[PDB]
């Protein structure tokens with residue numbers, strides 16, 4: 001399949017998704033992420049810093065009030081509620097309104113990844129080797145079809161004592 005370039009022309013609209021999942025596909029439960037890996041936190045910041053980040057309203061809610069908006073990035077929150085407000089950030093009503101920058105990283109959660117996938121050309125995935133089964137109401141990662149080509153890293157070992165690995169996926 002035809003080659004893509006890592007360089008982002010300023011007149012384009014590159015959309016990437018970045019998430020961390022358990023091997024089962026779980027990304028969230030009860031309004032939180034059920035792990036903290038320093039390597040994943042650092043990786044998330046390395047990829048997203050300097051770009052626009054787009055998140056669903058429930059992901060904004062999951063950020064501690066003292067830390068949001070996440071610094072060094074333009075924070076955009078998706079909501080359908082006309083009275084939802086995000087101090088320090090922009091709330092918009094659609095993905096179309098959110099995707100105005102040349103490079104945008106969609107940072108969660110389950111609903112917004114599913115919504116944004118049709119426009120995305122990159123996914124950066126951390127897989128955590130934690131035995132966490134899927135339960136009703138869990139937020140889940142998108143499943144990538146065969147239009148996506150991927151590179152899977154070898155299993156690595158976190159200082160937190162969990163194995164993890166990184167995937168990078170691309171499509172035209």
Ligand SMILES: NC(=O)c1ccc[n+]([C@@H]2O[C@H](COP(=O)([O-])OP(=O)(O)OC[C@H]3O[C@@H](n4cnc5c(N)ncnc54)[C@H](OP(=O)(O)O)[C@@H]3O)[C@@H](O)[C@H]2O)c1
Nearest residue numbers: 019020028032033056057058059079080108109110111112
């Ligand atoms: N592991 C990770 O990488 C990762 C990353 C981020 C989040 N998470 C976890 O994922 C969970 C949250 O995911 P979630 O799926 O429940 O929610 P979400 O995707 O973060 O947010 C859903 C909300 O976004 C808004 N929304 C959805 N579709 C929209 C559309 N088409 N237009 C406008 N607004 C739209 C709605 O807000 P309104 O209800 O206000 O209308 C909806 O309730 C939490 O557990 C969080 O901790 C995990």
Ligand SMILES: CCc1nc(N)nc(N)c1OCCCOc1ccccc1C[C@H](C(=O)O)C(F)F
Nearest residue numbers: 018019020033040041044062063064107108126
């Ligand atoms: C690191 C998690 C993650 N990892 C990958 N790979 N992709 C993602 N989209 C992702 O979610 C980013 C959005 C949710 O962030 C939070 C959720 C609850 C509490 C604190 C934070 C802020 C983070 C922290 O300090 O833990 C900070 F590092 F961003």
Ligand code: NA
Nearest residue numbers: 019124125126
């Ligand atoms: Na990742």
